[PDB]
Amino acid sequence: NCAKEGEVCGWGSKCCHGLDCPLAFIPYCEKYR
């Protein structure tokens, strides 16, 4: 559902909404820049 900056997305989370989670082998939720 949601993840905190430094969390693994695409396999564990997908960014709550304030984080950017790209679709890759090992993507991580990070603030949009």
Side-chain angles (χ1 to χ4, degrees):
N1 199 37
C2 287
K4 301 187 180 181
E5 185 179 359
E7 277 288 271
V8 38
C9 103
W11 315 111
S13 206
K14 60 181 180 180
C15 284
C16 202
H17 256 123
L19 294 169
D20 187 346
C21 143
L23 265 50
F25 174 78
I26 183 163
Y28 267 67
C29 268
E30 62 189 359
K31 299 271 176 62
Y32 180 78
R33 58 182 172 84

mmCIF file of all heavy atoms in Angstrom:
data_model
loop_
_atom_site.group_PDB
_atom_site.id
_atom_site.type_symbol
_atom_site.label_atom_id
_atom_site.label_comp_id
_atom_site.label_asym_id
_atom_site.label_seq_id
_atom_site.Cartn_x
_atom_site.Cartn_y
_atom_site.Cartn_z
ATOM 1 N N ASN A 1 0.860 -1.215 0.000
ATOM 2 C CA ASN A 1 0.000 0.000 0.000
ATOM 3 C C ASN A 1 0.880 1.245 0.000
ATOM 4 O O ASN A 1 0.913 1.991 -0.978
ATOM 5 C CB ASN A 1 -0.893 -0.010 1.242
ATOM 6 C CG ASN A 1 -2.079 0.928 1.040
ATOM 7 O OD1 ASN A 1 -2.619 1.019 -0.063
ATOM 8 N ND2 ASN A 1 -2.516 1.636 2.044
ATOM 9 N N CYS A 2 1.591 1.458 1.103
ATOM 10 C CA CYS A 2 2.475 2.610 1.232
ATOM 11 C C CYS A 2 3.873 2.180 1.662
ATOM 12 O O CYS A 2 4.066 1.094 2.204
ATOM 13 C CB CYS A 2 1.911 3.610 2.246
ATOM 14 S SG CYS A 2 0.485 4.489 1.559
ATOM 15 N N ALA A 3 4.843 3.051 1.408
ATOM 16 C CA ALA A 3 6.233 2.773 1.765
ATOM 17 C C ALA A 3 6.931 4.041 2.221
ATOM 18 O O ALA A 3 6.544 5.146 1.843
ATOM 19 C CB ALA A 3 6.994 2.220 0.562
ATOM 20 N N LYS A 4 7.975 3.869 3.021
ATOM 21 C CA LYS A 4 8.735 5.003 3.509
ATOM 22 C C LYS A 4 10.050 5.112 2.746
ATOM 23 O O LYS A 4 10.664 4.099 2.406
ATOM 24 C CB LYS A 4 9.017 4.840 4.996
ATOM 25 C CG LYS A 4 7.692 4.741 5.744
ATOM 26 C CD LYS A 4 7.959 4.764 7.242
ATOM 27 C CE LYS A 4 6.635 4.659 8.003
ATOM 28 N NZ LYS A 4 6.901 4.709 9.468
ATOM 29 N N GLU A 5 10.473 6.341 2.473
ATOM 30 C CA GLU A 5 11.707 6.576 1.742
ATOM 31 C C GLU A 5 12.777 5.576 2.171
ATOM 32 O O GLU A 5 13.107 5.471 3.351
ATOM 33 C CB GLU A 5 12.196 8.002 2.020
ATOM 34 C CG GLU A 5 13.421 8.297 1.162
ATOM 35 C CD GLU A 5 13.909 9.721 1.415
ATOM 36 O OE1 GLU A 5 13.289 10.409 2.209
ATOM 37 O OE2 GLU A 5 14.900 10.102 0.814
ATOM 38 N N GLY A 6 13.309 4.842 1.198
ATOM 39 C CA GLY A 6 14.335 3.845 1.479
ATOM 40 C C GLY A 6 13.746 2.438 1.460
ATOM 41 O O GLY A 6 14.437 1.463 1.752
ATOM 42 N N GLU A 7 12.470 2.342 1.103
ATOM 43 C CA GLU A 7 11.802 1.048 1.037
ATOM 44 C C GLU A 7 11.879 0.483 -0.379
ATOM 45 O O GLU A 7 12.053 1.225 -1.345
ATOM 46 C CB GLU A 7 10.337 1.192 1.455
ATOM 47 C CG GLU A 7 10.232 1.156 2.981
ATOM 48 C CD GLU A 7 10.491 -0.258 3.490
ATOM 49 O OE1 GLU A 7 9.540 -1.018 3.585
ATOM 50 O OE2 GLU A 7 11.637 -0.563 3.778
ATOM 51 N N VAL A 8 11.747 -0.833 -0.492
ATOM 52 C CA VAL A 8 11.802 -1.485 -1.795
ATOM 53 C C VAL A 8 10.424 -1.520 -2.433
ATOM 54 O O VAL A 8 9.470 -2.026 -1.844
ATOM 55 C CB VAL A 8 12.325 -2.912 -1.642
ATOM 56 C CG1 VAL A 8 11.766 -3.521 -0.355
ATOM 57 C CG2 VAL A 8 11.876 -3.760 -2.836
ATOM 58 N N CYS A 9 10.327 -0.975 -3.638
ATOM 59 C CA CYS A 9 9.059 -0.943 -4.346
ATOM 60 C C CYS A 9 9.097 -1.863 -5.556
ATOM 61 O O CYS A 9 10.165 -2.220 -6.039
ATOM 62 C CB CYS A 9 8.790 0.471 -4.821
ATOM 63 S SG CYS A 9 9.132 0.564 -6.592
ATOM 64 N N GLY A 10 7.923 -2.237 -6.044
ATOM 65 C CA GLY A 10 7.832 -3.107 -7.208
ATOM 66 C C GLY A 10 7.909 -4.560 -6.788
ATOM 67 O O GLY A 10 7.630 -5.463 -7.575
ATOM 68 N N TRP A 11 8.286 -4.776 -5.537
ATOM 69 C CA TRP A 11 8.392 -6.116 -5.019
ATOM 70 C C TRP A 11 7.952 -6.161 -3.561
ATOM 71 O O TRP A 11 7.754 -7.231 -2.986
ATOM 72 C CB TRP A 11 9.828 -6.601 -5.135
ATOM 73 C CG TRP A 11 10.358 -6.254 -6.484
ATOM 74 C CD1 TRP A 11 11.312 -5.338 -6.728
ATOM 75 C CD2 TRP A 11 9.974 -6.798 -7.771
ATOM 76 N NE1 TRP A 11 11.564 -5.300 -8.088
ATOM 77 C CE2 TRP A 11 10.756 -6.184 -8.776
ATOM 78 C CE3 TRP A 11 9.036 -7.762 -8.149
ATOM 79 C CZ2 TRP A 11 10.607 -6.522 -10.123
ATOM 80 C CZ3 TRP A 11 8.877 -8.108 -9.503
ATOM 81 C CH2 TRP A 11 9.664 -7.488 -10.490
ATOM 82 N N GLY A 12 7.813 -4.984 -2.971
ATOM 83 C CA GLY A 12 7.405 -4.881 -1.578
ATOM 84 C C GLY A 12 6.381 -3.770 -1.388
ATOM 85 O O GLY A 12 5.413 -3.929 -0.643
ATOM 86 N N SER A 13 6.599 -2.642 -2.061
ATOM 87 C CA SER A 13 5.683 -1.514 -1.945
ATOM 88 C C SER A 13 5.538 -0.794 -3.282
ATOM 89 O O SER A 13 5.986 -1.288 -4.317
ATOM 90 C CB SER A 13 6.203 -0.536 -0.896
ATOM 91 O OG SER A 13 5.112 0.187 -0.343
ATOM 92 N N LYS A 14 4.905 0.374 -3.252
ATOM 93 C CA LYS A 14 4.700 1.151 -4.467
ATOM 94 C C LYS A 14 4.559 2.636 -4.141
ATOM 95 O O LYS A 14 3.772 3.337 -4.772
ATOM 96 C CB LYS A 14 3.445 0.656 -5.191
ATOM 97 C CG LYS A 14 2.226 0.820 -4.281
ATOM 98 C CD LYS A 14 0.982 0.299 -5.001
ATOM 99 C CE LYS A 14 -0.238 0.461 -4.094
ATOM 100 N NZ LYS A 14 -1.450 -0.041 -4.800
ATOM 101 N N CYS A 15 5.327 3.102 -3.151
ATOM 102 C CA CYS A 15 5.282 4.502 -2.742
ATOM 103 C C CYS A 15 3.870 4.893 -2.320
ATOM 104 O O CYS A 15 2.899 4.617 -3.021
ATOM 105 C CB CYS A 15 5.750 5.401 -3.889
ATOM 106 S SG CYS A 15 7.556 5.333 -4.063
ATOM 107 N N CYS A 16 3.762 5.527 -1.155
ATOM 108 C CA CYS A 16 2.457 5.926 -0.649
ATOM 109 C C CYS A 16 1.792 6.914 -1.594
ATOM 110 O O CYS A 16 0.609 6.786 -1.912
ATOM 111 C CB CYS A 16 2.595 6.559 0.735
ATOM 112 S SG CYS A 16 1.011 6.450 1.621
ATOM 113 N N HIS A 17 2.559 7.901 -2.044
ATOM 114 C CA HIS A 17 2.030 8.910 -2.957
ATOM 115 C C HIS A 17 3.001 10.070 -3.083
ATOM 116 O O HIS A 17 3.060 10.747 -4.111
ATOM 117 C CB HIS A 17 0.685 9.438 -2.450
ATOM 118 C CG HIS A 17 -0.431 8.831 -3.255
ATOM 119 N ND1 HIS A 17 -1.460 8.111 -2.668
ATOM 120 C CD2 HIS A 17 -0.695 8.831 -4.601
ATOM 121 C CE1 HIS A 17 -2.286 7.710 -3.650
ATOM 122 N NE2 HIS A 17 -1.865 8.122 -4.850
ATOM 123 N N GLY A 18 3.758 10.286 -2.025
ATOM 124 C CA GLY A 18 4.739 11.370 -2.001
ATOM 125 C C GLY A 18 6.104 10.873 -2.454
ATOM 126 O O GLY A 18 7.066 11.639 -2.513
ATOM 127 N N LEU A 19 6.176 9.587 -2.770
ATOM 128 C CA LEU A 19 7.417 8.977 -3.214
ATOM 129 C C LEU A 19 7.265 8.445 -4.635
ATOM 130 O O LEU A 19 6.165 8.121 -5.079
ATOM 131 C CB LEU A 19 7.803 7.842 -2.262
ATOM 132 C CG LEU A 19 8.138 8.415 -0.875
ATOM 133 C CD1 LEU A 19 8.253 7.279 0.145
ATOM 134 C CD2 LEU A 19 9.480 9.160 -0.922
ATOM 135 N N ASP A 20 8.380 8.377 -5.339
ATOM 136 C CA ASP A 20 8.392 7.897 -6.713
ATOM 137 C C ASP A 20 8.985 6.503 -6.776
ATOM 138 O O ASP A 20 10.169 6.324 -6.488
ATOM 139 C CB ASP A 20 9.236 8.820 -7.587
ATOM 140 C CG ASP A 20 9.111 8.411 -9.050
ATOM 141 O OD1 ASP A 20 8.617 7.323 -9.300
ATOM 142 O OD2 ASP A 20 9.508 9.192 -9.899
ATOM 143 N N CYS A 21 8.169 5.525 -7.155
ATOM 144 C CA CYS A 21 8.651 4.157 -7.255
ATOM 145 C C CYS A 21 8.676 3.693 -8.715
ATOM 146 O O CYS A 21 7.635 3.397 -9.299
ATOM 147 C CB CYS A 21 7.767 3.217 -6.439
ATOM 148 S SG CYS A 21 7.592 1.643 -7.308
ATOM 149 N N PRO A 22 9.836 3.624 -9.315
ATOM 150 C CA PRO A 22 9.982 3.175 -10.728
ATOM 151 C C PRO A 22 9.869 1.662 -10.862
ATOM 152 O O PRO A 22 10.119 0.923 -9.910
ATOM 153 C CB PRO A 22 11.370 3.682 -11.113
ATOM 154 C CG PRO A 22 12.138 3.738 -9.833
ATOM 155 C CD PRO A 22 11.141 3.972 -8.719
ATOM 156 N N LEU A 23 9.485 1.210 -12.051
ATOM 157 C CA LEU A 23 9.335 -0.212 -12.306
ATOM 158 C C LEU A 23 10.640 -0.780 -12.839
ATOM 159 O O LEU A 23 11.003 -0.569 -13.995
ATOM 160 C CB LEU A 23 8.210 -0.441 -13.314
ATOM 161 C CG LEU A 23 6.900 -0.738 -12.575
ATOM 162 C CD1 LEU A 23 6.646 0.322 -11.495
ATOM 163 C CD2 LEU A 23 5.752 -0.709 -13.581
ATOM 164 N N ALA A 24 11.341 -1.492 -11.974
ATOM 165 C CA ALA A 24 12.621 -2.085 -12.330
ATOM 166 C C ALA A 24 12.883 -3.344 -11.507
ATOM 167 O O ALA A 24 12.045 -3.763 -10.709
ATOM 168 C CB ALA A 24 13.747 -1.081 -12.083
ATOM 169 N N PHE A 25 14.054 -3.934 -11.708
ATOM 170 C CA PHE A 25 14.432 -5.145 -10.985
ATOM 171 C C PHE A 25 14.458 -4.890 -9.482
ATOM 172 O O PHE A 25 13.868 -5.644 -8.708
ATOM 173 C CB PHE A 25 15.809 -5.613 -11.447
ATOM 174 C CG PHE A 25 16.251 -6.779 -10.597
ATOM 175 C CD1 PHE A 25 15.735 -8.058 -10.839
ATOM 176 C CD2 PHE A 25 17.173 -6.581 -9.564
ATOM 177 C CE1 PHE A 25 16.140 -9.138 -10.046
ATOM 178 C CE2 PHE A 25 17.580 -7.659 -8.772
ATOM 179 C CZ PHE A 25 17.064 -8.939 -9.013
ATOM 180 N N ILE A 26 15.137 -3.820 -9.073
ATOM 181 C CA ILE A 26 15.219 -3.469 -7.660
ATOM 182 C C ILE A 26 15.042 -1.967 -7.467
ATOM 183 O O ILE A 26 16.000 -1.242 -7.205
ATOM 184 C CB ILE A 26 16.559 -3.912 -7.092
ATOM 185 C CG1 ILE A 26 16.602 -3.609 -5.600
ATOM 186 C CG2 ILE A 26 17.690 -3.163 -7.795
ATOM 187 C CD1 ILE A 26 17.734 -4.408 -4.975
ATOM 188 N N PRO A 27 13.835 -1.498 -7.588
ATOM 189 C CA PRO A 27 13.497 -0.069 -7.421
ATOM 190 C C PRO A 27 13.200 0.286 -5.967
ATOM 191 O O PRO A 27 12.727 -0.552 -5.198
ATOM 192 C CB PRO A 27 12.259 0.109 -8.291
ATOM 193 C CG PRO A 27 11.704 -1.264 -8.542
ATOM 194 C CD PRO A 27 12.642 -2.278 -7.903
ATOM 195 N N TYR A 28 13.488 1.526 -5.599
ATOM 196 C CA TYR A 28 13.259 1.990 -4.236
ATOM 197 C C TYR A 28 12.454 3.284 -4.238
ATOM 198 O O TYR A 28 12.618 4.128 -5.120
ATOM 199 C CB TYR A 28 14.602 2.206 -3.534
ATOM 200 C CG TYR A 28 14.992 0.946 -2.793
ATOM 201 C CD1 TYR A 28 15.309 -0.224 -3.502
ATOM 202 C CD2 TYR A 28 15.034 0.949 -1.394
ATOM 203 C CE1 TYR A 28 15.669 -1.386 -2.806
ATOM 204 C CE2 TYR A 28 15.392 -0.214 -0.701
ATOM 205 C CZ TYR A 28 15.708 -1.381 -1.407
ATOM 206 O OH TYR A 28 16.061 -2.527 -0.724
ATOM 207 N N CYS A 29 11.582 3.432 -3.246
ATOM 208 C CA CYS A 29 10.756 4.624 -3.145
ATOM 209 C C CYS A 29 11.592 5.831 -2.752
ATOM 210 O O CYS A 29 12.256 5.830 -1.715
ATOM 211 C CB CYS A 29 9.653 4.410 -2.109
ATOM 212 S SG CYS A 29 8.171 3.773 -2.931
ATOM 213 N N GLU A 30 11.547 6.864 -3.581
ATOM 214 C CA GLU A 30 12.304 8.079 -3.297
ATOM 215 C C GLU A 30 11.496 9.310 -3.686
ATOM 216 O O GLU A 30 10.687 9.264 -4.609
ATOM 217 C CB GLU A 30 13.623 8.056 -4.069
ATOM 218 C CG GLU A 30 13.327 8.020 -5.567
ATOM 219 C CD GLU A 30 14.613 7.770 -6.346
ATOM 220 O OE1 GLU A 30 15.652 7.657 -5.716
ATOM 221 O OE2 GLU A 30 14.543 7.688 -7.562
ATOM 222 N N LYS A 31 11.711 10.406 -2.967
ATOM 223 C CA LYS A 31 10.982 11.640 -3.242
ATOM 224 C C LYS A 31 11.204 12.076 -4.687
ATOM 225 O O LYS A 31 12.309 11.962 -5.218
ATOM 226 C CB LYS A 31 11.469 12.750 -2.308
ATOM 227 C CG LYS A 31 11.207 12.372 -0.850
ATOM 228 C CD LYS A 31 9.812 12.855 -0.444
ATOM 229 C CE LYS A 31 9.511 12.402 0.986
ATOM 230 N NZ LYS A 31 10.491 13.021 1.922
ATOM 231 N N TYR A 32 10.144 12.569 -5.318
ATOM 232 C CA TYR A 32 10.229 13.015 -6.702
ATOM 233 C C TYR A 32 11.144 14.231 -6.825
ATOM 234 O O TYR A 32 11.004 15.202 -6.082
ATOM 235 C CB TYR A 32 8.834 13.371 -7.220
ATOM 236 C CG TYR A 32 8.931 13.841 -8.651
ATOM 237 C CD1 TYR A 32 9.083 12.906 -9.682
ATOM 238 C CD2 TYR A 32 8.868 15.207 -8.946
ATOM 239 C CE1 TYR A 32 9.172 13.338 -11.010
ATOM 240 C CE2 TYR A 32 8.958 15.640 -10.275
ATOM 241 C CZ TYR A 32 9.109 14.706 -11.307
ATOM 242 O OH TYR A 32 9.199 15.132 -12.616
ATOM 243 N N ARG A 33 12.079 14.166 -7.770
ATOM 244 C CA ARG A 33 13.016 15.260 -7.993
ATOM 245 C C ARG A 33 12.963 15.724 -9.446
ATOM 246 O O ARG A 33 11.901 16.144 -9.873
ATOM 247 C CB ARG A 33 14.434 14.801 -7.653
ATOM 248 C CG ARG A 33 14.798 13.584 -8.505
ATOM 249 C CD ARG A 33 16.197 13.095 -8.126
ATOM 250 N NE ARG A 33 16.480 11.823 -8.784
ATOM 251 C CZ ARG A 33 16.945 11.775 -10.027
ATOM 252 N NH1 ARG A 33 17.151 12.877 -10.693
ATOM 253 N NH2 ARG A 33 17.192 10.620 -10.584
#
